[PDB]
Amino acid sequence: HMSAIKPDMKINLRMEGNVNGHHFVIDGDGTGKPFEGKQSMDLEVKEGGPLPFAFDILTTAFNRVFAEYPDHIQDYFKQSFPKGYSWERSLTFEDGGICIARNDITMEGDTFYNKVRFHGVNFPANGPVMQKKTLKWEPSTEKMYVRDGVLTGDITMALLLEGNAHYRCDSRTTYKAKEKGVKLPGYHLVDHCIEILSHDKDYNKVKLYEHAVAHSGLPDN
Amino acid sequence: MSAIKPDMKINLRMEGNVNGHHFVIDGDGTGKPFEGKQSMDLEVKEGGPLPFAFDILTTAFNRVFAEYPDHIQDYFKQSFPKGYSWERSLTFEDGGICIARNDITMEGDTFYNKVRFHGVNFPANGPVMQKKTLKWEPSTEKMYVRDGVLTGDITMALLLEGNAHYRCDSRTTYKAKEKGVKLPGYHLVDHCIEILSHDKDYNKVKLYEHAVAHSGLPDN
Amino acid sequence: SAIKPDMKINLRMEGNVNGHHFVIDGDGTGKPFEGKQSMDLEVKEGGPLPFAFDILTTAFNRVFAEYPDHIQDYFKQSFPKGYSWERSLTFEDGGICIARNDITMEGDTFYNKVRFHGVNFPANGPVMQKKTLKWEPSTEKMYVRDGVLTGDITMALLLEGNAHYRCDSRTTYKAKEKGVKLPGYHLVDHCIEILSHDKDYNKVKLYEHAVAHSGLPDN
């Protein structure tokens, strides 16, 4: 239908979560261009700071409506508004650390609202996360498809570590629309790149940016 | 002057969210720490009736209730009266993943458990959302130290109607709250857990568990 | 190089999946610098295969990837002495495959000795029941772990009725000669296709196109 999505969107996000027995609340004002698949956010930890973990593991939980979609790819995400949609996500890191995240997404005019939740367990004390040895998320490629009838995305992720070592994480998100009638898209790919643009010593304030582009792979891309 | 007594009470509240259905469950239990045997009556206070298999939360309803033999260090009875806390991951073969955690404390003859539980990515047509589970099969927990921390891994299996099984890998880390508590060597904990009875919609459940720690073959 | 812009390809695989043994020969031709290669495969032994042919197909040389100038090309750098890989394919339903290929080049031809071993596919899975359609296009991630080039992939077989069958690959790349320069983190896009086949895939014509890039926001 007609979406309600206009090319400059405000972004309003709200995260509550616990890693390793440590609670934190974080807020973010942000703005974006859904149709260019770009956005940036100003996160500010409202409780639980300084976080004793790496802020990087939180970042992808900070909306694939901001994915530049070609018209030969069904945009399950933009066609899900006004009503909106919600995702669930597991992150499984290679040292048995595992997070689950939920984000539920609505729209009040020029603004997306995100009630996000984040939980992480089993991070080992001398690992990259708890010792905060992380540098950035490398550029990834999300594999999009339908299983048991739900748009699913899997990703093979890797965090750059000091020493230019890499820390592997597997990602699986399930997206569900709030409204009936949303066409399921054929299998596709979504390149992204996420980025901490600026940040203070303790990470209590953070500038985040993301660029996500959908494509069919080779070749034709 | 022991912190652990032969007949103990168990007081628990869990709060969780699986597939986005919120819930709070409360349990009122009794145990025999030295016999590794305990039972519990749980009543759902919010979220009833639960739209997923009650079974998935049951191991998240305390290893002080294991019978430990003298030749295996008993970390959990050693962690009291101050307490301890576990974090747990449950990874289901169909994408089902839960994380959970329990902070156990003690007042006199009573354990106080604050428990959380979050489950994502269970399919609509799987054994959990369809409520086809009957019971956790009796299982063996592998206990070992990794990075300063007591850790158990378990190959779990949920028995289903039609008698197929449905697999879960669990990892649990246990952390004493007081310093200095001595880490056990490598060992095994035998478990069996059961819903003795329940009301139709699982708003009231009586749970029972039994765990016995051992060293395996060939000394058992 | 001495890797020519038009290479020929000599393949020879020997395999065993679910205790079914097979031997498969393939000869083809390539445009290494364009990142493209097709091959005519023939099952010399153990056919008609009791399982989906697609699972063997990535087992049928990253040297055929278009590498841009800002990315180290480990694979063409490894020649003319060559390189090797072991790979593991972990499928969602417990089915596991491992593969190895030694890749040598004498003259204008690449030679591959390729091994491939599969265990624990369920009797009624998409693999033993032949319900696979094609691999979907993919995107290998290349990084270094413990001084060895590694490429991990989120793979997915398209099946009958458009369902998918997930698979996770890990591949480790080892240059033959010492101290060949390890590349920085990067991606290869892939697309592999059976172009045509006969009834029981005793005869198979394959194509693959790989392009290396450093991801957004550049690619």
Next chain:
Amino acid sequence: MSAIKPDMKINLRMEGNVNGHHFVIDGDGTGKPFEGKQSMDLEVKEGGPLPFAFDILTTAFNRVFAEYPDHIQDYFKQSFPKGYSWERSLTFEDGGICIARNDITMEGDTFYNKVRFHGVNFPANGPVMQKKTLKWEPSTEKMYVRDGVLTGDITMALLLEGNAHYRCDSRTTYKAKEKGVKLPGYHLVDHCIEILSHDKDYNKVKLYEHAVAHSGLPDN
């Protein structure tokens, strides 16, 4: 008139490759199936000496030698004179991934095993390639039926030099050569395996394993 005797011989030859290194290990030993014990002296005919920890081949060297109680259907002993076969995947925590196979048959009082074994992606600096393993810890195989086939999953751990552990998940699929043989229901199989003896190079090795099957708690 039962096929299996209380004192069998074992003839086993293995062919294998880990990390591009080929090898052949031949074997000769004995054991008591109804007791669930066996032992064998293993000779490296080729590939020797072996770069990698010898322990990772050890479980790949027959559940016939498992002690089953009358209340559990013994799939393996009900497989013979015809015999049975297994496939194995070993998935190590640091990316190392093994797959193995064996066809077990019988000729008189001898079991004959054709063992294949292939490990890939073991990190040059790991305990595997660096040979810092000491032993497998005692374990418990979880036996159940998937798609009509006997499948046992294990939570394995290697003890390494320095009191650390190395984790490995096992999945084995068991298939009789004979039609009809009836599958048991869920059970546990306690294992313990031991290099009893070996030369500095590990080209000659004496092995011992002990298997006992049971219903787990509280029926053990």
